[PDB]
Structures are given as structure tokens and as C-alpha cells.
Amino acid sequence: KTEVVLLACGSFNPITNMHLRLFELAKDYMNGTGRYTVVKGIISPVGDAYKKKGLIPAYHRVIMAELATKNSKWVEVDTWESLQKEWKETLKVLRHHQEKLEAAVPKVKLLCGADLLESFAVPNLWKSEDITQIVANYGLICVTRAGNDAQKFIYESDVLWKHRSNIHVVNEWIANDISSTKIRRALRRGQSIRYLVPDLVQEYIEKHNLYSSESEDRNAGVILAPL
Amino acid sequence: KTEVVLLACGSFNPITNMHLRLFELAKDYMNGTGRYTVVKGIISPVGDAYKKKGLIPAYHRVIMAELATKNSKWVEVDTWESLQKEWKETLKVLRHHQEKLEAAVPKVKLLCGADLLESFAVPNLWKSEDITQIVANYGLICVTRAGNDAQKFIYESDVLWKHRSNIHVVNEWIANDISSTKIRRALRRGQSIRYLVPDLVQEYIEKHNLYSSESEDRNAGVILAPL
Amino acid sequence: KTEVVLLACGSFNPITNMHLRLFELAKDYMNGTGRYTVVKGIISPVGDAYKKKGLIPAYHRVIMAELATKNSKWVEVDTWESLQKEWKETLKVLRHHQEKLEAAVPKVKLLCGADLLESFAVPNLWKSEDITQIVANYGLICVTRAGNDAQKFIYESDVLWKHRSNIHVVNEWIANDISSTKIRRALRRGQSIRYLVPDLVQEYIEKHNLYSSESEDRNAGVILAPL
Amino acid sequence: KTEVVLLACGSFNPITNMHLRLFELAKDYMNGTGRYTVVKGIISPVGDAYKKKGLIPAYHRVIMAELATKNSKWVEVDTWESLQKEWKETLKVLRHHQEKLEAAVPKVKLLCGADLLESFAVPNLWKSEDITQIVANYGLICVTRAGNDAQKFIYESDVLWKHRSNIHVVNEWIANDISSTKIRRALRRGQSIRYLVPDLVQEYIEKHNLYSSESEDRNAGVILAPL
Amino acid sequence: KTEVVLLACGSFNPITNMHLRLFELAKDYMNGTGRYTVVKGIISPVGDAYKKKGLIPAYHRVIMAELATKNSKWVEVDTWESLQKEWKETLKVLRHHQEKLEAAVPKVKLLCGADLLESFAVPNLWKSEDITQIVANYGLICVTRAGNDAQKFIYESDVLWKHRSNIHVVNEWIANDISSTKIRRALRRGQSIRYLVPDLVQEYIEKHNLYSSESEDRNAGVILAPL
Amino acid sequence: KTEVVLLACGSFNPITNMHLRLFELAKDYMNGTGRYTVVKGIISPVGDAYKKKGLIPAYHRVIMAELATKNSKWVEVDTWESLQKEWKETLKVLRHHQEKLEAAVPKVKLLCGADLLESFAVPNLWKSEDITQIVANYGLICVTRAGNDAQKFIYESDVLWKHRSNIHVVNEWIANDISSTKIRRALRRGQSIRYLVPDLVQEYIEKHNLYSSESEDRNAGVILAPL
């Protein structure tokens, strides 16, 4: 049947009902295919070295996620990436977790949304062969409201298409779209966030005034993709 | 400043993060206008006499809502409508709650989405003067992803436009759209619902297999609008 | 690996390069999945009993198809259905060919575009259990330019969704859309048709002035879906 | 009545049913206006000097067209452009053929699609006066699925608008879109192509493995528009 | 060159800058084709017998047009239609004016917008042969913001397409859309109208409270298309 | 009630009925809110120092506006800005008129379309604090056909959102869109312009051949936003 473990790399600024729902979606999919059984889901907040704009320090991110998942029987956080001194290429993170498992072989597979995927085209953001290796040796599960675009994008690229049998596009009927950005912005304006993220999360947020604008100013100088 | 109390009539089949979020939205709005202060929010599940398709029996609806709101300091359920033997015209429900308050006068105002509003045009669904009275003597707060349409619709009708100063369209940035229907359908197929509704709710649902299809067959014969 | 035989029932008024391309698309898909091997394709024109508007006599339809396929190694016509006295439900046609094969068991699968699919919703056009049996015991392969729509349509139905794992939506990159309707029209107005249909067809058409308008008037009275 | 000859310059990498259909469309239009009589159509593959990416050697391009036109009574190929040692501006080619005819004067008219037309705005791609001369002394026939855009395009340009009476936008009902790019891609992937291009063409292609990807890498360095 | 007269039949409830602009557009087009010379334009308000909803008495309609055209060198009103005691089919009015001219023969051509044209499909609204005659013996000039639609519309109709050479679609860049309906509504609501209609018109309207709503209730019972 | 004076800064190249209608729309809104009373409207053409492309000399702009407003009871031109030696920041112009009023305090408010608004995002075009002061101490009234966009734009910005209660978006039902650009263009090609601009304007334009193309070439070098 092939046990699987879904890895989700991402900034995970304010983790939100969405990211949680993604896991719900991906699972129901693969389980529902018959050729799979989802064993566990891993959230892996990016390190601070990633240096993206408005990226608050990892502790908060890892914490929030954990709080976020406290009540889940299959999704657990995982801090290895957030502690590295140097930013980690997704490929390396995937390998890591796979190698770990090899110490009855659940395949690790990259969980993701459209953006990630489409970001494959950003110049210098990815190592051509990184993409290859990823798609080739570890699956890629993409859950989106924008099914078609995702599928064109694949059609559009020889590398992806060649390994399309390892890429699954999961349709998000019922619109999520609770983007980190919109959530931060709300916070910044004293809006509400309630119901868009898990309570403990909200509460962790409000008692700690985590998102400000002083915060959004963070890292106003080139991310760690430029090699 | 004018204290206000938001009344939300609706089937409230599976109440969901959305309906809860609506209240969050409406409040933040009126409070943010300065000319208002939201005092309390009321959920009022429809009676069974409404006889709409797939409408499971009220007990469940009222319960679920309550569970739904257990943790809210300002939104409370209210069962008066669900007990009436005859289906109640929204106008009558509004009056009720207003009259109740008159026993320092918080104005009751109808909380709602686009559908409701647009349903004003369905033939025989509303008593022309009911609309009038509603809009005239009690406000109408409409939160939507479809701001424009809502505003055209108003522009489109002399009755509404005339009382437009009592109608407020609230823009839903960050897409909700967790419709009851999609949730039921999911349930029916053993999907997940998790994160789209409050846990106690989910749990109440799963321990009780509330939505089936046998259930959706309910009331396959003309609703209570036809007078 | 599972050998497969693609069955395409359809009026096949002027068969056109589209029809032919669908088979080419369908096959490349299945074969390209690894779980399949496309063995042969069958074109089965409707009988005259179907009584659809502008449906010229089977003889012309059957022949044109044959000419159309004369040069194909794997797609052949089949006249069983065009001969029956009474219109035949697609489920019966599927059964027929499957049973004939059972006289090493290639699964017959229904080749299809969106229209047919989406017509499962027209009232009285299909016997609910027919759809079910179809999708359950024989696959459904649907090639379209409208991927998402088709997928929504599936999402939108308990029956289909349930048997989703036997329904494949094949995306048609590169627009076809040479509808029979459009070609009839053209013919009617002395346009061209060349390069939209196979030459032998074009030729058979022009030497026989097959489509007129007197012809389009054919069957101006209720098709044979109405039981 | 004014006899006309339609000239189509273009890379004509895999010539396809589309290209052929264009002629059939343009003709029908002009002839159907009553002001014109289409005498002959000319295919003129671009030279190798053009230095476009993935542009395979001319001889293949010319041969394939010739096979594609073998059975046409009025569309013939023309190799004068493919033999030039320096890339030829479309204006020169137009003159060429016109001059040729002047040795009862059929007007040569440029046949094209939207992209060509829209390329008039690309910086440095065209000599302003070249555009002028073309549109002024030789017509421009543009068949498109994107009628409106084409017409805005004209509206938005003083030069074109001024000579609008010599520009005809021919609407393509029934979708073509068999782009050479799409074809090449398919070929690379072992797809089908059958029924997108004329048979002799496909055969010529299969028996010669003409498109590979090593081929697509051809000319990875600035085309000969930059003067 | 063929001199032409543009005739516009229409309710012309509040005539507006739009109506006037139409003429200016149509003219510019025909004159700009070189095949034509626009001699005069005629406004012909419909009679009261037409029995359209909200159709105020003709005299007001005719007067307002006249004021609206007072300062035009070529567009004049024409009251023959407004005096008839029975509603007149557009075809009869076209004949009328043509006949008139025949007492050097300027062709009368119907000036209109999309809706009119598109109304050709409304059941029972038009006598099939009426359409025929109109389009065949008198041209049809259609200015629209919705160019494409208009052109599909023609493509989709055998009758129209056959006479397409007598139908001209004139594209309206720069949005009009000052619909009489919109105007009336405004008026009812005490809005503005200024700069949507000619000043003498607005003044005529203000000094006469012409549009009320009691007025809009006019003719609440089937127009005179139903023969 | 709060008296108000609507200030509209703009190039006012050919002033057009649109410009005039904006004032009509703006006023009906404010007055129709009850919280306001529109006292006067001011048109303030830009100085020549602005140095925008195709900006003909202030004299013509100022005069045309005056002619345009000659017949208005409440909208008057104002030449203060056109006279200054140096281009003037809109904030200064707002201040000026406000200060002049303070010599019973009518609030001056900036009248505006979407473009201006949306240009708050162009880099270096506006001084962040200028926007702030503007929105904070002087309102911003924006009439558009693109309501939502405008509202999103607001949503999308901390600064604007913060002072949202002083920004009103007025919806323009009935399409205007007579852009100066379009009219210039037309003029350039001898089209018409009649009914899009006030007659006295049209007249002043045609007797003076104001717009040419030599004129459009004016200022082909960097506007005065670049500080």
C-alpha cells in the first residue's frame, strides 16, 4: 500500500486554519486513492536565515505551530530546520526526514500549495536539478483552489511533466485562502483573526502582540535564494 | 453612540467557522465606524416548519450552534423561533427581539450575507412591505465577498436604495465560503470538515452521524415562503 | 497491466478530426499512466431511432466514420448499434461490447467529452442506476478543454464522486472544438470544412451534398431519452 | 473585382492544419466580400538566418510545407526567402512577390495571425516606416480567435488606424490554436500530433525524428530583429 | 459613392447624449469607409401604441428629441411614426422613409445598438421575413461596446450571416451606456442627469417633472409585438 | 451638517463631460448622506511645470474649463496653481484653498478618480507623509466605475485603511470613461468629440486646432514627481 509521510516546508508565519486544512485535504486524497496510507504529517517552519520580509523569529513560529497541532493525532511539528545556522534548501530538508525514517519504508512527500510550485519558475530561486531530484525521488502533493493553472504549469514544463506521475494536484473545493499576509495585515489593524486560526494560536498572538509593522519591516534586503 | 445587537436568522444547518466569522466581521465594522457599539450577537436557528430541503430537525441545529458559541463572550443562541409551531417571517422575529429589548434602547439589526439579500427578488418569497419595514425600522448588515454585486443589487431597487442609509455592505477580504451545503456534502462522503467548523461541533457531528443523504431527502416538497 | 478498449458512442454526425483526436488523446493518457495498455478503439454511431434534430440517416454516418478510420491501425467502426430497431441505452451498448469481448479480459471503457458527462444531470435523460452501473463496472474517460468544469461536475455528484477512481479527465491542451454543429453550419453556407475533417470524408460529403438545412429540420419532435 | 494573392511569411516550424486553415479562412472571407477574388496563396518559410530559438534547418521546413500543400489547388510554397543568405524583412519579401507578379495586377496581401500584428509594438522588432509601407501599399489579413483584441490593437495605433481600410480582421469561429510550439512539445514527449498536421507531414516527421530538444536549443542567442 | 440616411427607431424615452453619439459614430464610420457618404440622420420616436412599460406620451418624446437636435446640422426628428394610430413594424417605417426619398437615391439604413439586433431572437417579436427584408433591402448599422457578441450573434444566424455584407458593426471605444432606464431611475430619485443629456433636454425635463414612477407604471400589460 | 467644498486637481487636458459629471456625482453622494452639504466645487488645472506628456499650455486648459463651467451655479475654476512657477504638490494646493477659506468652516475635500488614488503606490510619485496628511486632514472622494478595485486598494494599505472614515468611494452607475486620452486621439484623427465635451469647449477646440500630435510630443522627458 505504501505508507506516506507529508512534509510541509514553509515560512509558517501565522500558521492558520488553512495550513492545517491542507493536511486534512492531502490525507483524505491519498488515503482515498487506495494506493496509499498517510502515516504522519510534519510541519517544518523555516529557519530565520531564510531572511524573508516580515519573517518574525523562529521560536514564535515553531511555538505557534505546536500550539496549533497540540490537538492533532497525526500532524507534528519538527524543529531541525529552524535550528540550522544556514538556510536549508528544501531538497536537503526532504532528504533529512527521509534519511531519518531509514533509521517498511514510508516515503516522504512534499506537501504544498500553488505558489511554491509556480515559484519553480522564478529565476535563481531553485536549482534546476533540485527540482528534478525532488519530483523524481520524493513526491509532490499540491492542494489548490487553482487546480487548472497548477496543471497547466505542469504541462508547461518538461521536467515536471516527465515526472508527473509523482505529482498530484488536489482540488480544494470550499475556499480556504486564509493567507498569512492577510492575517498579519489584520492583526496590524487590530482586526480579529478569530476563527481563521486555532484559538491557542490566537491567544498566543494577542498575548505577545507578535505582529506590528515594525515586524513587517524585518529583512528588507534580499532573501536566501540568490545562492 | 447607539448600542446594537446583531440578529442572524438562518437555517444554520451545520453552523460553521463562516457564520461565526460573519459576526466577527460585522462587529469590527460597526465598532470601527464610531457611530456604533455592538453589544451582543444572537443566532436564531430556523424552525422545522420552514420545510427546506435537507433541513434536519431543529434540536440538532440549536444544539450545534450553542456548542459553537459556548466559548463566545458576546454571541448567544436564541431558541424562540425554533419552537414556534408555524414558520416565522423574519420580520416577526426581528420585532420579537426588539420588543424583548424594550422590556438605552439597543437597535436590533439583521445580520446577513448576499444570498438572503438577493433572495429579496425571488417572486413571492418576501412580502414587499416586509422588506420595507425591515430595512426601514431595523438595519441590514450584509457581509460578503461579493461587495459590488451586493451594491448593484441595492442600486437596482428603489425600496432598498431609498433606505440605503440603513444598509451596510461589509467587505469580506480573506475568503470564507464554507457553505453549509459543501460541508454536508463532505460529511456525506466521509471527508473531513475539521477546521471548517468548531471542534465541539465536529465532534457533535461525528458522534451522531447527523448528515446522511437520507437526511438531504428531507422536505422534498415546497418551502414555507409560498405564504 | 490491464488491456483496454475505448468505446465512443455518439451521433457522429460529420465525424471530424476532433473525434479522431479524442482517441489519440485518450490513448496517450492511459498508456502514459503505466497501469494500462490501450488495445483498440471503437466508434459506434447512433441509430436513427435516437431521433435527434438534424440527424441524417445512419448509413452516411457509418460510412463516413469508416472512411475516417480507414487509415487507422487501432480505431475501427462498429455498426451493431446503428442496426437495432430501437434506440439503445449506452449502458446496453457498453455491455454488448464487453460481453462480445468475453467470447485476458480487456476492460471496455466509455470515451467521452464534457457534454455527455454534464448531460447526466438533464432530467429524465439518464436512468440514475444506469449512470451508476456505467461508472461502476465500466470506466469513463473524458477528454476536454474544460478540465475544471468536468472535475467540479464530478465533485458536485455523490454517485460520480463515489466512483471517481474509475473516471479520468484528460486535459486537451491545444484547442479542438471542431463541433459537428459548426461544421454542419459551414457546409450549409458553402464555407470549407477542409482540414477540419479527413479528406475522404470531405470528399464523400461534397459528392453527396449531405448537409442542407432540409436535413437540419430532421426530427423536429422529442428525442428518445423520454423513455 | 481585384484579384488577390495571400502571402504568409512565418517560421512554419511544423506547419499544421492551422496554417492551412488560415488560408481557407482568409479566402472565404475576401471572396465573400464581393470586392475580391483570391487567386493564389503562397507559403514562404523563413530563412535559417532569422535565428529563432528551436528553428530547425529550412530545407525541412520547406519540404514539409510542400508535402502539406501537395494536394492543394491554390496554395503553393515559395522558397526565395529560405535561400537568401541574410534574413529578409517582411517588407522586402512582400515587394519581391509583388514585383514578381508585375512581370490585371493581383495585389499581394500579407496573411497573418494576431501575434504577428501584435508584435508591431515590440521595440526594435519593426521599422516604423516598414509597418507603414506594409499596411499602406500591401494589405494585411489577420485571422484570429481574438478578434476584439486585434481590433483594439488597431484602434490603439495611429499608423494602423489610419490605414485601417486595408486591414481586415477575420474571425475564426471554431477554435484552431494548433500552435507549432504545442506540436513540438508533443513530439518531444512522444505524444501524437496525428490529426493536428497533414499525414504526409506527420510521416515525414516520424521518419526523421525531426524535433528533439537538442533541436529546441538551436539559436540560444538573439534573433535578427535587432537590425 | 452612395449617399445614405441613417434612421433610428426607438422609444427614445429620455433621449440622451448616447443616442446622439450613436449618429456621430455611425457617420464617421460609413464616411470613413470611402464607399459611403452620410447625408442625413433621422430620429423617429415610437408611437404610444407600442405600449411599452413606462413609455410616456409621444409628444414629450418628440419634443425632447427636437430640442436635443435643435443645433445639429444633419440629424432631424420625424414624427410620422408617432402619429400613426396603430403601432408600426420597423420594416414599415423603413419603407416609409425610403419611399419618401423616392419622391441619386440615398439608401435608408437602420441605425441601432446591440439589444435591438439581439432582440431578433425573441420569440414572436419579429416576423422572420421582416428581418429578412430589413437586412436584405435596407442595411443595418449597429454601434456597440459589445462588438464581439454582436458578431457572434450574426455568425449564429443563417439569415443574418447570409446578408452580413449589409450589416456593419461599429465599435464604440470610449464607453457610452447612458441608458434611458438609468436616466429615468436617477430622475425618480432626484439625482442629476446633467451632462448625460443635452441641456435643453434636462431643462425641459426639470420643468415638467416628466419621470415619476407613476409614469413608470404606464402600460403594465403586454407590448404590441404579440402581433 | 458640515459644509464642503470639492477640490479637483488634474491636468484637465480637454475637460470633458466626465469631469463635469464627477462633480455632479460627488455632490449627490455627500448631500445624500445627510452628514454633509456641498457648497461649491473648484476645478484647478495643473501648471505647465508638471511637465507631463502631451500637456498643452495652461492657458488653453484654464480657459476651456471656464467655458466648460460658465453655465454652472456651483462649479468654478481656479487659477492659483496654474500660475505658480514651480509645480505644486497636491497637498499644498489643498492647504492653500483651505487656508483661503479660513479668511462656519467648510472642509475642503479632494475630488478624485481611481487612477490618482491608485497612483499613491507608484514609487516616488508621492511623499508618504503627504498621503497621510491628505487623507487625515482633508477627505478624499473618489468616484469610479471600478468600485471594488478602489476598495481593495484601500484595504490593501495601512495608511489609507487607517483613515478610511475620511475616504468615500462613490460608485458610478452609468459608464463615463470619456478619458482625455481618448478624446485627444479622436481629435488627432478628425473624429468627432461632439457630445463628449461641452459645446463651447468643442467650439474652442475646433477653432484653434488645439490637439495635433506635435502637441502630443510635448514634454517627452520625466515628469515633476521625481522631486
Ligand SMILES: NC(=O)c1ccc[n+]([C@@H]2O[C@H](COP(=O)(O)O)[C@@H](O)[C@H]2O)c1
Ligand atoms: N530552492 C529552494 O529549495 C527554495 C527556494 C525558495 C523557497 N523555498 C522554500 O519554500 C518556502 C517559502 O514558502 P513560504 O514563503 O510560504 O514560507 C520555504 O519554506 C522554503 O524553504 C525553497
Ligand SMILES: NC(=O)c1ccc[n+]([C@@H]2O[C@H](COP(=O)(O)O)[C@@H](O)[C@H]2O)c1
Ligand atoms: N419572507 C421572509 O421573511 C423570508 C423568506 C425566506 C427565507 N427567510 C429566511 O431566510 C432564511 C433562509 O436562509 P438559509 O436558507 O441560509 O437558512 C431564514 O432563516 C429565513 O427565515 C425569510
Ligand SMILES: NC(=O)c1ccc[n+]([C@@H]2O[C@H](COP(=O)(O)O)[C@@H](O)[C@H]2O)c1
Ligand atoms: N441514457 C443513455 O444511455 C443515453 C442518454 C442520452 C444519450 N446517450 C447516448 O450517448 C450518446 C452521445 O450522444 P451525442 O454525442 O450525440 O450528444 C448518444 O449517442 C447516445 O445515444 C445515452
Ligand SMILES: NC(=O)c1ccc[n+]([C@@H]2O[C@H](COP(=O)(O)O)[C@@H](O)[C@H]2O)c1
Ligand atoms: N521588419 C520585418 O519585415 C519583420 C520584422 C520582424 C519579423 N518579421 C517576420 O514576421 C515573421 C513571423 O514568423 P513567426 O510567426 O513564425 O515567428 C517572420 O517570419 C518574419 O520574418 C518581419
Ligand SMILES: NC(=O)c1ccc[n+]([C@@H]2O[C@H](COP(=O)(O)O)[C@@H](O)[C@H]2O)c1
Ligand atoms: N417587426 C418590427 O419591425 C419590430 C418588432 C419589434 C420591435 N420593433 C421596434 O424596434 C424598436 C426599439 O425600441 P426600444 O429600443 O426603445 O425598445 C422599436 O422602436 C420598435 O418599434 C420593431
Ligand SMILES: NC(=O)c1ccc[n+]([C@@H]2O[C@H](COP(=O)(O)O)[C@@H](O)[C@H]2O)c1
Ligand atoms: N505628490 C503629489 O502631490 C502629486 C503627485 C502626482 C500628481 N499629483 C497631482 O494630482 C493630479 C492629477 O494628475 P492627473 O489627473 O493629470 O493624472 C495632478 O494634477 C497632480 O499634480 C500630485
